[model samples]
Target: MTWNFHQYYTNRNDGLMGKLVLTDEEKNNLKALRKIIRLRTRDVFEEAKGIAKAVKKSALTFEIIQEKVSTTQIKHLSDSEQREVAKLIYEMDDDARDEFLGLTPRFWTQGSFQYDTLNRPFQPGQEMAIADGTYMPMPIFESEPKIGHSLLILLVDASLKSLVAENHGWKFEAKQTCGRIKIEAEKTHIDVPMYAIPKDEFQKKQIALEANRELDSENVNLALREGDRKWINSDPKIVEDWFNDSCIRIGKHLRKVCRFMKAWRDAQWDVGGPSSISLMAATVNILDSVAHDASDLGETMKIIAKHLPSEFARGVESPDSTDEKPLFPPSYKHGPREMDIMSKLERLPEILSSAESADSKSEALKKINMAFGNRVTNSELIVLAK
Candidate 1:
């Protein structure tokens, strides 16, 4: 049967003896792209997780959304909202509104892991199997804040989205009619190879079921990057580097980018899995749940600034600026630098060397904030330096 993404479930080919019609090259493309996307998704969410942890003790509400988590946008609150929050605070009894909003077991897992099977389900005469890998997160549904509604999102919109769209040979579903943004795949006359072997019938059935479910799963046609063959072949890591750029460039603005993706998806502009709109909604709801209280560290800063070269802080690159140079590869640089927290703390001396006066020092801190998208701030910087 012909592959009809929209009609996959209703199609007659829903179940039968068949295999993914992809060639070794196509599989390689899918594997590479999937790895790239997976890494990116991991990077964005990990930062979100960090931000969430620092503010978990704040006096606001928090919920785990699909790709994002929803928490107080404390600093971005409007006057009226602030007033409401204040009033609400006043009404609560002394102990009821403690400034510290701590989560038990400082470390808690928002995501879970599972073994992904390597085969599809089979009927009486068909085959079944396992590859030992696994999976799924269900969006939790709650009332007041109706949070955690993104159970099916495999990816979200961000610089990552921008990066993927810019690369040629990729065919993703960025539909406007329904705004269902998903990766696209094709059907073929040949069978794709399966590497893993399942041990039992139950496992085989699970594998088959999973495969059948994603029969029309998106495929990254190897030919899509055909035009970049020269560059791609010359350096096997070009794609890897592109992905690193995507992940690293987003930096602290990762949350903001998430917001834009959510906005576009919500607005039904160019839309993905769960329709771009649905995915965006999930993204926004989840991101909204994350707390970004830079002051949580008390006098210390929350951003990482150590390895960031002086060049990245050059001029001002608005988070929204397009046609800008790559911030990760960094211009006038030797190579990649560590942008993590400890490194930033260690670079305190380097950051202070050029600042002779209070004002200059403030500007240096501002540069850190600007260069790193406010991942850390002036107050935090001062405290960290001391």
Candidate 2:
């Protein structure tokens, strides 16, 4: 008997698969958090600018010095030397230095959160996963000790704390290891990863954007603070574009399969499993080999189950880049986590096949429950063969 469980997987009402996407309330919470970050960062920048201006006028008489420095010796200094002199000038006055470096953050939604495949019923302390977009708050300064990425992030963190503290229920923390600020309210949180770009590059990008010219992607370099507190070049847009383009090429059913896989992962492990990006990349990498069928989710699951163990063993790579860094990094591949995930995946084909060949709806649902947890409701079950 051939069982069809497509509706059971895709139905909007009480379907285990369908429930993986964020609901309206969940999406609204994330949107509200984005707005809060945008407005507060703007206010903080303006306030910092005013304080810097006041310090320059009252303490330094910087206008006269600026005039003399530019009018007299500016031509003598090389471009590099000029930047060094500017850095020295700012170092003398920290308040002015912050304004000299700071730019209001520009936010971009990215990752699985932006891809519409974020798994629901988030695990405890995983609320920040709901909002995966980052805040690109540019604090552009030349290579200098006094104005490193960590210091800039500290400034923003301080300002964020002050502003968020004004609200009754909002709270935030800097997860230094993860290199992002997490803000929580109403039982949901937004993980605001910060990135820095060079001032000149940012200005040029802005100018090109204002003129509606085609901006060169090569020219824009964004750096994120790593766990070691050093800056590294990172661009979420590349992955975002890769995933979106893959969806367009492969069909949206690819996304549905990703969601289903994520649902299965979430059910199988309480924590310490393959990340969403890794899973998505693996699915995209193996889709053609598995001969993915969006219509038959059960068979799709079975085939993917058959292939994924070997894929996990091989280590998943980024969908479109030859970075040579596995999406499932060596650390995870070396650990027992990969083995645990692969073992569960290895069992999925048998579990699913049992559900397919079950003689009774009750027996089918029992098998489905074993595979997907109790989330699969009995009423949602459909048996094709009597």
Give the best candidate by TM-score.
2
Clashes (backbone N, CA, C under 3 Å), per candidate, total: 36, 0
What stretches of model 1 exceed 4 Å from their correct place?
1-21, 57-146, 150-155, 159-162, 169-172, 175-386
Name every residue pair that clashes in candidate 2.
none
* Tens digit of per-residue lDDT, candidate 2, span 58-100: 6655454343334322323344543444344444556536645
* Superposition TM-score, candidate 1 onto the true structure: 0.22
Weakest ten-residue segment in model 2 by summed lDDT: 214-223
Q: What is the lDDT of candidate 1?
A: 0.27
Please give the lDDT score for candidate 2. Answer: 0.62
Lowest-scoring 10 consecutive residues by lDDT in candidate 1? 105-114
TM-score of 2: 0.78
